[PDB]
Amino acid sequence: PGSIDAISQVINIAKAHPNFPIALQWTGGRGGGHHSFEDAHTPMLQMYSKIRRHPNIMLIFGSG
Amino acid sequence: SILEDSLENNEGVPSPMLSISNLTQEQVQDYVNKTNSHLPAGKQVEISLVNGAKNLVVSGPPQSLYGLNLTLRKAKAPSGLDQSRIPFSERKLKFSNRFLPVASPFHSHLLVPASDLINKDLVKNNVSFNAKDIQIPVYDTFDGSDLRVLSGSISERIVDCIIRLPVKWETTTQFKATHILDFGPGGASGLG
Amino acid sequence: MKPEVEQELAHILLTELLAYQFASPVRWIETQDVFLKDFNTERVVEIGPSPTLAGMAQRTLKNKYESYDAALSLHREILCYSKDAKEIYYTPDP
Amino acid sequence: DVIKGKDFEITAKEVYDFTHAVGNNCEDFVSRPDRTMLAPMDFAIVVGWRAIIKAIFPNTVDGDLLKLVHLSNGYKMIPGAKPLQVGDVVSTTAVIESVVNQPTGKIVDVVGTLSRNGKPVMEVTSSFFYRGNYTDFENTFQKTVEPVYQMHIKTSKDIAVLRSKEWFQLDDEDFDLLNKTLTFETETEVTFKNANIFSSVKCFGPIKVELPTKETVEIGIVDYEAGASHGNPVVDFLKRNGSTLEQKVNLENPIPIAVLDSYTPSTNEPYARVSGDLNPIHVSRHFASYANLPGTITHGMFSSASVRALIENWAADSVSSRVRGYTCQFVDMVLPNTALKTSIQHVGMINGRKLIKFETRNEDDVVVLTGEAEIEQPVTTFVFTGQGSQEQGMGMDLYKTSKAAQDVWNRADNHFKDTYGFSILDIVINNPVNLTIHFGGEKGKRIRENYSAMIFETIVDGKLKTEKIFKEINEHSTSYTFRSEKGLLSATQFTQPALTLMEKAAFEDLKSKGLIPADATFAGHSLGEYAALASLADVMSIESLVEVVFYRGMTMQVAVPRDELGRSNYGMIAINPGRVAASFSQEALQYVVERVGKRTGWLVEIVNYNVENQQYVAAGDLRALDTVTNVLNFIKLQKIDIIELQKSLSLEEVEGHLFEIIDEASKKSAVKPRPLKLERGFACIPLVGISVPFHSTYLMNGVKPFKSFLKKNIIKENVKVARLAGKYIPNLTAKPFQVTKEYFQDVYDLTGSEPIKEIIDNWEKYEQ
Numbered sequence A: 001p002g003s004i005d006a007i008s009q010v011i012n013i014a015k016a017h018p019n020f021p022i023a024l025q026w027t028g029g030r031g032g033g034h035h036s037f038e039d040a041h042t043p044m045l046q047m048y049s050k051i052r053r054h055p056n057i058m059l060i061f062g063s064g
Numbered sequence B: 001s002i003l004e005d006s007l008e009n010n011e012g013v014p015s016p017m018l019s020i021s022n023l024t025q026e027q028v029q030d031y032v033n034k035t036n037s038h039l040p041a042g043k044q045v046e047i048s049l050v051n052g053a054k055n056l057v058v059s060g061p062p063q064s065l066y067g068l069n070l071t072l073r074k075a076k077a078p079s080g081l082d083q084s085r086i087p088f089s090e091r092k093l094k095f096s097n098r099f100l101p102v103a104s105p106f107h108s109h110l111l112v113p114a115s116d117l118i119n120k121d122l123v124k125n126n127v128s129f130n131a132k133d134i135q136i137p138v139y140d141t142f143d144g145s146d147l148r149v150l151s152g153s154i155s156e157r158i159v160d161c162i163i164r165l166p167v168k169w170e171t172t173t174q175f176k177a178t179h180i181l182d183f184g185p186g187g188a189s190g191l192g
Numbered sequence C: 001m002k003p004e005v006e007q008e009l010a011h012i013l014l015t016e017l018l019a020y021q022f023a024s025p026v027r028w029i030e031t032q033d034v035f036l037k038d039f040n041t042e043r044v045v046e047i048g049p050s051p052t053l054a055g056m057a058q059r060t061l062k063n064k065y066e067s068y069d070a071a072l073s074l075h076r077e078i079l080c081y082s083k084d085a086k087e088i089y090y091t092p093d094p
Numbered sequence D: 001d002v003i004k005g006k007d008f009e010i011t012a013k014e015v016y017d018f019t020h021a022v023g024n025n026c027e028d029f030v031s032r033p034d035r036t037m038l039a040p041m042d043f044a045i046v047v048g049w050r051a052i053i054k055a056i057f058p059n060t061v062d063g064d065l066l067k068l069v070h071l072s073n074g075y076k077m078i079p080g081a082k083p084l085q086v087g088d089v090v091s092t093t094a095v096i097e098s099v100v101n102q103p104t105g106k107i108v109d110v111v112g113t114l115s116r117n118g119k120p121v122m123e124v125t126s127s128f129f130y131r132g133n134y135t136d137f138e139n140t141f142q143k144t145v146e147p148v149y150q151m152h153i154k155t156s157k158d159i160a161v162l163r164s165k166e167w168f169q170l171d172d173e174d175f176d177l178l179n180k181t182l183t184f185e186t187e188t189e190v191t192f193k194n195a196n197i198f199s200s201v202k203c204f205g206p207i208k209v210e211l212p213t214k215e216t217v218e219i220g221i222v223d224y225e226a227g228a229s230h231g232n233p234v235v236d237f238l239k240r241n242g243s244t245l246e247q248k249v250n251l252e253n254p255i256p257i258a259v260l261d262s263y264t265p266s267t268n269e270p271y272a273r274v275s276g277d278l279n280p281i282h283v284s285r286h287f288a289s290y291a292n293l294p295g296t297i298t299h300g301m302f303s304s305a306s307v308r309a310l311i312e313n314w315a316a317d318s319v320s321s322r323v324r325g326y327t328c329q330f331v332d333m334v335l336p337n338t339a340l341k342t343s344i345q346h347v348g349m350i351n352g353r354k355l356i357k358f359e360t361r362n363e364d365d366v367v368v369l370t371g372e373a374e375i376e377q378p379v380t381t382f383v384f385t386g387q388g389s390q391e392q393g394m395g396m397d398l399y400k401t402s403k404a405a406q407d408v409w410n411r412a413d414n415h416f417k418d419t420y421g422f423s424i425l426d427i428v429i430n431n432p433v434n435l436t437i438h439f440g441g442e443k444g445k446r447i448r449e450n451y452s453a454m455i456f457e458t459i460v461d462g463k464l465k466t467e468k469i470f471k472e473i474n475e476h477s478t479s480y481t482f483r484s485e486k487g488l489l490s491a492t493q494f495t496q497p498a499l500t501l502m503e504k505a506a507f508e509d510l511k512s513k514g515l516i517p518a519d520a521t522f523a524g525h526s527l528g529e530y531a532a533l534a535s536l537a538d539v540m541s542i543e544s545l546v547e548v549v550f551y552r553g554m555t556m557q558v559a560v561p562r563d564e565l566g567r568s569n570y571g572m573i574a575i576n577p578g579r580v581a582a583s584f585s586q587e588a589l590q591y592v593v594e595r596v597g598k599r600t601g602w603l604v605e606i607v608n609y610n611v612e613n614q615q616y617v618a619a620g621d622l623r624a625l626d627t628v629t630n631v632l633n634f635i636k637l638q639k640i641d642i643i644e645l646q647k648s649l650s651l652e653e654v655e656g657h658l659f660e661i662i663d664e665a666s667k668k669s670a671v672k673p674r675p676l677k678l679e680r681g682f683a684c685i686p687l688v689g690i691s692v693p694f695h696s697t698y699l700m701n702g703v704k705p706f707k708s709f710l711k712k713n714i715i716k717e718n719v720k721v722a723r724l725a726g727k728y729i730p731n732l733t734a735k736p737f738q739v740t741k742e743y744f745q746d747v748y749d750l751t752g753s754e755p756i757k758e759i760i761d762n763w764e765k766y767e768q
Helices: A004-016 A042-051 B002-008 B025-037 B062-077 B114-126 B154-163 C004-018 C028-038 C052-064 C066-071 D014-023 D039-056 D154-165 D234-238 D268-276 D284-290 D300-315 D396-401 D402-422 D424-429 D442-453 D492-512 D528-537 D541-557 D586-600 D620-635 D640-649 D652-671 D706-711 D741-751 D754-761
Strands: B017-021 B046-049 B056-059 B096-099 C044-049 C077-080 D068-077 D093-102 D105-117 D119-131 D141-150 D169-170 D182-192 D198-210 D214-226 D242-245 D249-263 D323-330 D341-352 D353-360 D367-376 D378-382 D432-436 D479-483 D521-524 D569-573 D604-611 D615-621 D684-686
Touching: A004 A042, B002 B062, B017 B062, B017 D284, B025 B056, B025 C066, B025 D234, B025 D284, B046 D569, B056 B062, B062 B096, B114 B154, B114 D234, B154 D586, C004 D528, C004 D706, C004 D741, C004 D754, C028 D521, C028 D528, C044 C052, C044 D169, C044 D242, C044 D492, C052 C066, C052 D378, C052 D604, D014 D039, D014 D268, D039 D068, D039 D093, D039 D105, D039 D268, D039 D300, D141 D234, D154 D169, D169 D198, D182 D214, D182 D234, D198 D341, D214 D234, D214 D396, D249 D300, D249 D353, D268 D300, D300 D323, D300 D341, D300 D353, D300 D367, D323 D741, D341 D367, D378 D528, D396 D402, D396 D424, D396 D492, D402 D424, D402 D442, D402 D541, D424 D492, D432 D442, D492 D541, D521 D528, D528 D541, D541 D620, D541 D706, D569 D620, D586 D604, D586 D615, D586 D620, D586 D640, D586 D652, D604 D620, D615 D620, D620 D684, D640 D652
Parallel strands: C044 C077, C044 D378, D378 D521
Antiparallel strands: B017 B056, B017 B096, B046 B056, D068 D119, D068 D323, D093 D105, D093 D141, D105 D119, D141 D182, D141 D242, D169 D214, D182 D198, D198 D214, D249 D341, D323 D367, D341 D353, D353 D367, D432 D479, D569 D615, D569 D684, D604 D615
């Protein structure tokens, strides 16, 4: 994911199969190569609680 | 005319208490300081509730709160602006604001007059609250303190705490606990 | 002051203002501020061929009355006889 | 006999009680911090009720008070009077206007006049009805105010017929009625003696004549008197032989405002207590039942104030101040706990106020109430446009539809034809490339002398250098010719009349539709200030206007040396301090232009201060204009914050700093050909057309010849002070016209004028 909506999408793929490991690699806008107009903290700061109510989501911070 | 306009701009039906969301307490106070700049004492609006982080509630005469509402109306942005291709720093403030369901300006200078009168009345009936009698801490709305550790009248405090003084809700919910029970009005739209 | 006397005076003042207007400059910025702020006009109507003094008073509002207007909740309406017939004569569509 | 009431102080709480009784939650009546409490115009009835009701009591007006019926009641605010306040002490006077026996019963029309501090504040009108069969023909009268009749004395027999009537009685019998317009403002007082036959008929009023200003002056009297009459001869005459001026003017279509839901009170005691109407009919069932009513009828007065509140709220946007007139017809009765949809539309105009009509029906869809209200327009200001935007055919559409328009244009077009030999309508209608006047027969020669007497005086150091404006027109000239490669409509001597005319015409149509607010403020931009003065203050005739304005243009076309091809040594530049730099302020443009003024010893001054930090205009020496336009271009590409360099350096330091910049650009334009062609800038635009540095100090010598021209055309008697005081914003001063020592001084300061200086110096000419 790279968007707040994108994250929310992953959360849905998560409910999809609650027993399956999903590595949500939250990248930021300050990464290398491909980009994003997005801040690295805001999205995560904002989605964290919801991301965390799904045990199958392995939250991984990247970029910078 | 006002009610008309305030309605076709997706804001509430003008009342004495406006609630602004996703703005710094500092940010909010800034716009109000501006609005209040142009008004006389008796028509000024102040922060009533600091319900939370970027959640506040301004309060005063409905019409002057409507004025604040206009100065805000230009500073904001259409909700579906899609600033996803704009660099973060460069983007525009998106934020919510609406009038609240209440007939009176609580926690404002408009009510200070009724302060002394209410107390003078509370005495003329049986009512008083001795710190001896309260069995469990009752956290002060402004202090966050206990109302028992109080030199003067606990009654008189909670009167002035509802009528004149702001509600620093997070600081008044200083305590630590496992569980909070909400007995107050309004299901999931309520304080809990 | 005596009515006839007031006339006589007010008269020559009026003629003075008009005579010398010829040389002195046009203080329109100060003027707009008189009726926009001192009087708080809500309907400023321009009577002319095209809307020139209007867009003048419109810019002035954005440039200076941005905040005043907002707080004091005054809706201002700027109308040119040229283009805003409907709004001046109170005769709309459906 | 007049009925005197009682003095009445309005307590803060009598108001609380009344507002709450009728249910009027307007904030103007509720005690708020730092505001005096206002009293509802409704409250007038609480004050006057005892003075008024007394009027239906005398023995000569014998009625069964238990069968009394209220027909109507209205309040009219006398103009200029502020609304009732909580402080006020109020004297009430109830005169009973008309008492007439009708087929169905006796009718009494009462008039209240609530005064405050000597002056009258508002009038209250009530008419009551004693039902039954009467015949007191002995004690029955009625005075009616006849509408104003206008009469256009066109012919010689017309004037003959009028002198034929004994009631037509003017001051100087020698008055030349021929070709004037008369108005007849008549009151007719009648007393009955029989069923249809009048006992006596009086009919009096002033006769007035229209002035060029369209003002009306008393010329004489209508004085009719007759016993055993049968009809009113005077009114019949004027009806058939005249037209009836009604001050109301309908809109094109009624404009709906709102449909509101109302309710009558559970009990009537609340209203009765505040109002002083203890009439048992409304409160005691046994009285109501004895009078054979449907029940304890709601006070008709409640419905009056209740509905009024709705009009107040929704039609006046809850600005108590705005409603100045309200009136109410009690169609049918209403019981307590009835619901009332009352509807409100905007029906027309009267004297700048919105005419509003309403109708209230009940649950059974029966009309119960109907009246109208007059409500003030929002604060209005009129600004009159100056030259520059004139288009061919401008306002010619309105000439085709509006009568007011035609009269304005035609009066003018005629004056122009008969004294200068051209049609301003033609020039406007089809922009003529050229136009020759021909000094034909006896009338041709009359015309040319009016051309020959065009003088341009020039007081230079005591000396008065006067020249003919029209050099060539002389005793041997057969014609003159105005020229313009584009079209004469854009040559100021014609442009100005055209503009003034279009505007004055348009405003007089607005005035005719009753759309001009009484207290509106006005101002004009250069030229438009004559149109503004003419339109709102009628300071001059339509002809005087086109005259003054036409000469103002000829004067400006000779107040500057011209070349062979008639070229100018001067011009105007329109600047925008914004475009130079976001830093470049007003004091910055002033500063810069004042330096390039002193430095080059040329002429530049700021002429138009139009929009702060955005639109300015400077005039003067074409060379000085080419410097400023370039000095400016430099400061922009150079990014020179002068507000910052003023802090860091000294006066003399930055002075010299641009004195250098000036001197490098000033060399460049002096070395340019004869009549330098001003070119565009970054913040400078040349005003193509203008050739005179007007609104600079340059035109200071051409003042006193115009200052006489104006005095010969703006007569003392046409300057009515109130039309200007506080409403008129000049251009010299930018402050509302006031005839005060204060004001007079400011004018001297901005101009230095003899007539003024003496006046300031000996202001104590106070006493006649």
